[PDB]
């Protein structure tokens, strides 16, 4: 037994980074447009590519398209990948996020990646980053925390933009406070720091911008996680 | 801005470690006793004293008694302490935990320590540790997970014995797997390693015991600096 063990991160590829960007919604869903969410999308895809990830963005899928896509990635072989990143940029409530047209419960999504129905990912980090609250040239919009900040399973790392009782801020040009600080830290420390250290650094950054916003992460990781180049 | 900034842990005292131990309950509650919770209580209490905490254990308090104690603490000054620690060992459902006689919402207890109601702690780590799940020689009991693993506010670290979809194990003589292991890591590394680093080691040790269903622990961190318990001695 060794206190400094790391996840094996020397497979051939680093892995897929899925990004579900949601800016607009069915009309009858009566949800606000999330202006500035593109800032985030592109930001993250820059930051994640730099780390070696194959980034795949999807904007405004309806539930069925979204379900089809995430099942399509959960059945390919992740045998020669390091880990798996998945990102949601939407509105949400309780334990649902919104596609363009309806809500899906998060656990049906993350569930596709437990050891059960994805053997190639066992023993590997699975990172879910949720930027999802409840609403509602550069302006600062404020949504209320609403998505319950909970986990998902062995070797998962749930990353929440804002916890219960706080508020998530989003600038209409620059993007979400939390995605900005996350990307800025990935910019500087992605390649050196242990991923959760980095996440505590984002905790300090966001909570220091002047209704506080205070992020949160839930870790069920069994090892230290670095993204050393390659 | 420093990436290796730590919490200031050089105060006069390390702080207080509350422990609420619940072994039995009022009988019109129809809850199993928690045989073994005593080793848990006693194990935690050795280790947290070794780290310099003033441990304070209470057994089987009632809702009214429990609220008293805990307000009592939230109000005494903490300006000369590093951090605060709370442990709950008991039964729980949802975002509720059980005293002797009735459940309590977990957030009236934690929210008692948010900046606005306890400024002596603002800026300092607040750690809550929760062994709580739903209950049915050295027999080994198996509870289903029930308490919502969710955080509180700034500078809080929430620690859960078990996360949704898994089961908490308790050995009648030995104690809870979760505590058993956490105490072992605190033993070997508590004074060296960073606490979340140590927490993730327990995640590994725990998710690797068998006997036919898994236990997987969970911590939710809203800490903003690194957290160490370097010896003061």
From Swiss-Prot, chain A:
* Control of this protein's activity: During activation, the N-terminal disordered prodomain is removed by cleavage. Concomitantly, double cleavage gives rise to a large 18-kDa and a small 11-kDa subunit. The two large and two small subunits then assemble to form the active CASP6 complex. Can be cleaved and activated by different caspases, depending on the context. Cleaved and activated by caspase-8 (CASP8) and subsequently by caspase-3 (CASP3).
Q: Where is the protein localized?
A: Cytoplasm; Nucleus
Q: How is it modified after translation?
A: Phosphorylated by NUAK1; phosphorylation inhibits self-activation. Phosphorylation at Ser-207 by AMP-activated protein kinase (PRKAA1 or PRKAA2) inhibits autocleavage, preventing caspase activation, thereby preventing hepatocyte apoptosis.
**EC number(s) per UniProt?**
3.4.22.59
Q: Which reaction does it catalyse?
A: Strict requirement for Asp at position P1 and has a preferred cleavage sequence of Val-Glu-His-Asp-|-
Q: Which residues carry this modification: Phosphoserine?
A: 49, 207
CDD domains under this entry?
A: CASc
**Outcome of mutating residue 143 to A:** Abolished processing and subsequent activation
Its GO CC terms?
cytoplasm; cytosol; nucleoplasm; nucleus
* Record carries keyword Glycoprotein: no
Active site per database record: 91, 133
Q: What happens on changing residue 207 to D?
A: Phospho-mimetic mutant; prevents caspase-6 autoactivation
Q: Name one Pfam family in it.
A: Peptidase_C14
* SS bonds (residue pairs): none
Q: Give the source's domain of life in one word.
A: Eukaryota
What does the record list as GO biological process? activation of innate immune response; apoptotic process; cellular response to staurosporine; epithelial cell differentiation; hepatocyte apoptotic process; intrinsic apoptotic signaling pathway by p53 class mediator; positive regulation of apoptotic process; positive regulation of necroptotic process
Q: What are the UniProt keywords, alphabetically?
A: Apoptosis, Autocatalytic cleavage, Cytoplasm, Hydrolase, Lipoprotein, Nucleus, Palmitate, Phosphoprotein, Protease, Thiol protease, Zymogen
Comment field on protein domains: The N-terminal disordered prodomain is required to prevent self-activation.
Q: Which family would the database say this protein is a member of?
A: Belongs to the peptidase C14A family.
Q: What does the subunit comment say?
A: Heterotetramer that consists of two anti-parallel arranged heterodimers, each one formed by a 18 kDa (p18) and a 11 kDa (p11) subunits. Interacts with BIRC6/bruce. Interacts with RIPK3.
Its annotated function is as follows: Cysteine protease that plays essential roles in programmed cell death, axonal degeneration, development and innate immunity. Acts as a non-canonical executioner caspase during apoptosis: localizes in the nucleus and cleaves the nuclear structural protein NUMA1 and lamin A/LMNA thereby inducing nuclear shrinkage and fragmentation. Lamin-A/LMNA cleavage is required for chromatin condensation and nuclear disassembly during apoptotic execution.
The protein's name: Caspase-6
Originating species: Homo sapiens
